[PDB]
Amino acid sequence: KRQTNQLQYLLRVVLKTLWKHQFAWPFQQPVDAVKLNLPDYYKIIKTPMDMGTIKKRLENNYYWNAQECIQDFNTMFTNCYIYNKPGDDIVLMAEALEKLFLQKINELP
Numbered sequence: 601k602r603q604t605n606q607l608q609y610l611l612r613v614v615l616k617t618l619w620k621h622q623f624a625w626p627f628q629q630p631v632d633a634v635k636l637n638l639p640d641y642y643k644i645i646k647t648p649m650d651m652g653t654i655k656k657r658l659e660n661n662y663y664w665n666a667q668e669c670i671q672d673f674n675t676m677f678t679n680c681y682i683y684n685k686p687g688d689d690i691v692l693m694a695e696a697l698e699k700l701f702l703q704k705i706n707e708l709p
């Protein structure tokens with residue numbers, strides 16, 4: 601049986617696949633509430649999360665384990681579902697990314 605590190609797999613396989621997805625671009629940096637005109641965002645969302653922050657955490661030895669990283673991805677998706685209206689384009693984009701994420705995480709070593 602091959603021994604492959606879970607956090608390494610999360611960086612090189614999982615994050616890489618999601619980052620390249622056509623719907624990844626609104627999730628590659630923190631939400632810019634000022635430019636997007638969402639003045640209530642940082643009041644409703646208490647733990648903001650994005651793939652750019654996850655990428656930095658994976659590169660800067662932040663995570664204790666793979667589950668702490670998985671929680672950051674889940675926070676990013678649920679923040680989107682909490683803030684935005686169902687049926688909004690951004691929600692449809694997050695749902696497609698979350699479906700791909702769950703597929704990739706099923707094959708985690």
Ligand SMILES: CCS(=O)(=O)Nc1ccc(Oc2ccc(F)cc2F)c(-c2cn(C)c(=O)c3[nH]ccc23)c1
Nearest residue numbers: 625626627628629630631632636680683684689690
């Ligand atoms: C890179 C971060 S950014 O903030 O610098 N750029 C950025 C650009 C577009 C965005 O969304 C859109 C998507 C598809 C459209 F057709 C129009 C949009 F505006 C969002 C965006 C992200 N997220 C997570 C939300 O929850 C959200 N709610 C409302 C906007 C958003 C963020």
